[PDB]
Nucleic acid binder design. Structure first.
Lengths: 144, 144, 144, 144, 144, 144, 144
RNA sequence: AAAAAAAAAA
RNA sequence: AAAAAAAAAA
RNA sequence: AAAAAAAAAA
RNA sequence: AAAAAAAAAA
RNA sequence: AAAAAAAAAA
RNA sequence: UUUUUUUUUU
RNA sequence: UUUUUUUUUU
RNA sequence: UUUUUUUUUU
RNA sequence: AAAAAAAAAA
RNA sequence: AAAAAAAAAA
RNA sequence: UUUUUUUUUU
RNA sequence: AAAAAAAAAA
RNA sequence: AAAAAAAAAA
RNA sequence: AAAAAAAAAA
RNA sequence: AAAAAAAAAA
RNA sequence: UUUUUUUUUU
RNA sequence: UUUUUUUUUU
C-alpha cells in the first residue's frame, strides 16, 4: 500500500454536520431495594463517562438487565423489568431467574418501531425489581 | 412489524465499553494572513462543538481545505497544504486554485497507513497558505 | 397419539412473564345524539367484560363502526368517524351509508405505524356521528 | 408504508367475542415441607397477577417444576411430580435431580389429549415433593 | 376514444370522505437574523395560500432549506438546520455551504418513521441559522 | 429502517407550486321535488367542507347519483340524469331504478375527454329527476 | 378420529401372558463408608417402590453410578465400580472423578451378552467405592 | 501477476 | 417443520 | 465493489 | 424499480 | 486501455 | 485497472 | 395454508 | 458475508 | 374400487 | 406401514 | 425419527 | 367468443 | 394491467 | 403468501 | 381432498 | 377480421 | 421458517 502522502482531488464544499448522531450501548448500574421498584431515569444515559454529555435526546431501542450483586442466602437471583413510556406505561413484568446461585439473572425487552420516540433526562426508561441490591443495565440506543 | 414490547432472552453479561472510538469528519475554520503559513493544531479537533471534548488522541486519515472568504481584487482563490508529522515534516505543497473568481479553491491529501499514528492536542496537522483570509478544513479522522 | 402422561426433560429456568401482551378485537357500543359528535374514550376498552381490566395502556390499530339501531323514518343509516390523536387530531370524516334502509351502515379506518403509540383511559379514540341512536364499535388493538 | 390514516371498507357486522380463550404459561411458587407431598390447587392459576381472574376453568397441557431455594447441607436438589386427575390419580413419580449442588433440579410431564379436560379452582394438578423448601412451577395451559 | 357521454352502471352507495388527506411540499420563506437561531413554527404550513387552511394537524417527512438572499460581503452562503421534536429536541446541525458566492446554499434532513407523529400550529419544526437574512424552505409533509 | 434524522444532500432550488391541482370525488346532496327537474350547480363543489373553497374552476369526469330518501308509498326508487354542457345541453336521460323498495336507485354517466373543459360556480352540471325528495351525488372531478 | 365406540371383529382366542417381562432402569441409593467397598445386592431391585415386587429374577444389562452427597473437604468426588458375577468376579475398577468440587462424579459399565444371565435377590451386582457417603445407582435390566 | 513513487488516460 | 389459542392477511 | 468505526443479525 | 397522497380497476 | 520516467515484484 | 520513468522482488 | 403475539418442543 | 449509522472513494 | 344412508369438508 | 407405553441411540 | 420388549391392527 | 344496427379503419 | 392527482426516483 | 401478539416445536 | 357414524367390499 | 356507439347473452 | 389461539386482508 501507499507509503507517503498522496494528493486528493477534492471538489465543491460538501454537506457537513459537526454534531452527528450515534448508535451506542450504554452500560451502567442502579441501586435497588428489596420489594421496591426503581424507576430508571433516562438522564443516566447523558454523561461524560459515555462521551454523551453533548446530547439532550435519545431513542431507546432495547433494554437488557443483569443482577450485579449476590442474592440473599438460600435464594437464586432474579430481575424484573417493567417498561415505561410517556404515552402510557406498560404492565408487563419480564422476569429472568438464575439457575445457579453463583450466576447472574438476566432478562431484557425490545421496544418496537412505533414506540421509538425521543426521550429526555426527565423521563424514565423502565422499572427494575430484583432480590439483589444492584442491577447492571445495557441499553441499546441512538443519541441525537 | 412488532407493535409492543417483546422479551429478549439475554445470556451472560457481554463485553462492554463505555468510551468507544468514533470515526468522524470534523469541519472547522482558521484565520490566515497573506504570505504567512498557518500551522493547524491537532487541538482544534477536541471540542464540545464536535462532541469530542472527551478524547485525548486522534488518528488523522485525510485533510481537505477550501477557501472560506473571497480572494483579493483581480485574483483567483488558491490554497496550499504542507503535511506535518512528528517523525518529520514534509515539503510537499499540495495546491488547488479556483478557475472562477466567485468559486472556492480546494485541495486535499491522504495520510498513508504507515504514518497513521496518534497525535495529541499539542501536535500540528499541516501548514496552510492562501490569499483569502479564512480557510475551511474538513479532516477525516478516528478518535480514540 | 399419546394416551398417558410422558416425562418432559426440562433444563434451566426459562425467561418468564406473568402479565404478557394480548392482541384483541374489543366490541362495545356507544349512544349518540342527532347532529352531535361523540368522543369515544379509550377507557371503554379496559373492563372485566373484556378480561382487560388489568391493562393500563393500549395500542389502537384499527377502528370499525356499525350502526346499532334503526335510522329515522325515510332515511338510510350512516356513520362518520374522525380519528383523534394526542399529537394532533385529524379532520378526516370517513363516512359510510347503507343502501337498504333495513341494513346497517359501516365504515372504518386504519392507524399507520407512525401513529401507533400508547393511549390511556383519559384519551379518546375518535369522534362518531350518526342519525341512529347507537353505534357498535370493534377496535382492533394491542393491550400492554 | 402509510404515514396517515386510511379508510377501511368494512362490510356486515362480524362474529364477535368479548371474552375469548388464551393459551398461557403461568409461573408461581409453592412452599414444600420435607418428606411431605404438597397438592397444587388449580385455583392458583386464577389471579389478577396473571390477568386470569376472569376465567373459571382451565385446560392443563404440561407442568414443569424447578427447585426455588437451596437444598439442605451436603445434598443435591431434587423434585418429584405425581400427576393428579379427577377421573383417577396416577402413581408416576417423575423425578429430576441436580448434578451441581448450586443448581436447580427440574422435571416435567405432559398431559395427553385424552386427559385434557377442564378443571376448576377446587381441583388439584399434581403432588410435589422436594428436599428444598420452595418449588417454582411453570404450567402451560389454555384458559376458557 | 369516446366522443359522447356514456352510462355508468353504478351499484350500492360507496364509502366516501369529504375531507381527505394530502401529501404536499409547502414552500415558504422566513426572516433570519445574523447569529440568532429562528424556530420555524408548524403553523406556517396552514394557510389559504397553500389550500391547507382547513387542516389542523400535519405529519412532516423531510425539511429542505435554501438561502434566499445574498450573503454579506466577502462571504459564502451557508445554512444550518436543527430538527426539533415534542418528545425531545435534537442537537444535530446539518449544514450546507455555497461553493460560489452567487449561488444558494442548501441542506436538508429526513425524519424517520418512528418520529412521524402529528404536529399542530403551536409546535416548531426546526431551528434555522444562516448569514443570509432570508431562507427559503420546502417541507414535504402529509396533511390530515 | 432509519431510527434518527439523516441528512439530505439537496442541490439547486426546485420548481415549486403552492396551489396545486387535486383529483377528488365530492359527495353532496340536493333537494328534488316530484316531477320537477333540478339543475345541479357547479358551485356546490367549492366549499370549505370539501377543502375546495380555494378553487374557482373544476373539470368534471363522471357523475353518480343515489336516492337519499325512501320513495313514496307503493313505489320503487328511481333517478334520472341529464348531462348539461355550456357548448350544448344533452337530451339523454340515464335512468336507474331500484329492484327493492328498501334499496336505493343508482345511475351515472361519464363525460368524454372532448367535453372536459373548465366549469365555474355559475355553471350547471346536470338535471336530476326522482320520485324521492333527496338525491345523493358523488362527482369525480379535478380541481384546478 | 373416531368419536364413539366401534365394533372389533375378533377371531380366535389369542396367546396370553398375565405376567410378562419388563425392561426397566431402577433408581436407588446405597450408603457407602470411607475406604470400604460395598456389595450392592440384586435384591434391592425387587420392590413395590419400583412395581417389581412380583419378580424373582432379573437380567442386568448395564450399571451407572453417581455420587449422591458432597465429598470431604478439599477433595473432589469419585466413585468406583467392580463388576461381580456368579461365574467369577471381575477385578476392574471403573473409576470416574468430578472436575468440579460441587458436581457429581459418575461412571458406568456394560455387561456383555455372554454374561447376561439371571440373578436372584441373594446375588450381588457390583462393589461400589466412594469418598461420598451415598451413591445413586441406575441399573438397566430386564425383569422376567 | 500484484504492490509503491513520478507521469498519462476514459 | 407440524399443531393449539389470540390477532392480522389474499 | 472492498476496507475502517459504531450498531444489529444467522 | 420501490414507498407514501388522491382517483380507478380485477 | 496503451506509452514514458522513478520504485517494487514473479 | 492499465501504459511510461526510478527502484525492488522473483 | 401463511404472517404476528404468548408459549412449548427440538 | 450482509443490514444500519458516521465517513471516504469512484 | 364403486354405490346407498347419516355426518363432516373445499 | 403408522400410532401408543417402557427402554435405548445419533 | 429409529432399535428392543408387551399388545393391537392389517 | 359469435351475431345484429350505426360509425370508423387497412 | 392501464389512465388521471399529489409525492419520490434513475 | 407475508406481518403482529399468545403458545408449541427441530 | 380429509375426518366422523351406519352400510358394503378385497 | 377488428375499434367505437346502442343492445343482448353469459 | 412452520403449527396453534385472537384478528385482519383477499
Amino acid at each position: 500500500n501507499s507509503n507517503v502522502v498522496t494528493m486528493i482531488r477534492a471538489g465543491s464544499y460538501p454537506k457537513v454536520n459537526p454534531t452527528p448522531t450515534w448508535v451506542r450501548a450504554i452500560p451502567f448500574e442502579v441501586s435497588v431495594q428489596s420489594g421496591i421498584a426503581f424507576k430508571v431515569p433516562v438522564g443516566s444515559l447523558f454523561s461524560a463517562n459515555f462521551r454523551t454529555d453533548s446530547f439532550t435526546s435519545v431513542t431507546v431501542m432495547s433494554v437488557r438487565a443483569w443482577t450485579q450483586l449476590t442474592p440473599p442466602v438460600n435464594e437464586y437471583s432474579f430481575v424484573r423489568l417493567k417498561p415505561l413510556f410517556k404515552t402510557g406505561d406498560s404492565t408487563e413484568e419480564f422476569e429472568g431467574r438464575a439457575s445457579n446461585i453463583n450466576t447472574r439473572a438476566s432478562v431484557g425487552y425490545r421496544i418496537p418501531t412505533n414506540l421509538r420516540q425521543n426521550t429526555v433526562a426527565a423521563d424514565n426508561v423502565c422499572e427494575v425489581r430484583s432480590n439483589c441490591r444492584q442491577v447492571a443495565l445495557v441499553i441499546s440506543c441512538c443519541f441525537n
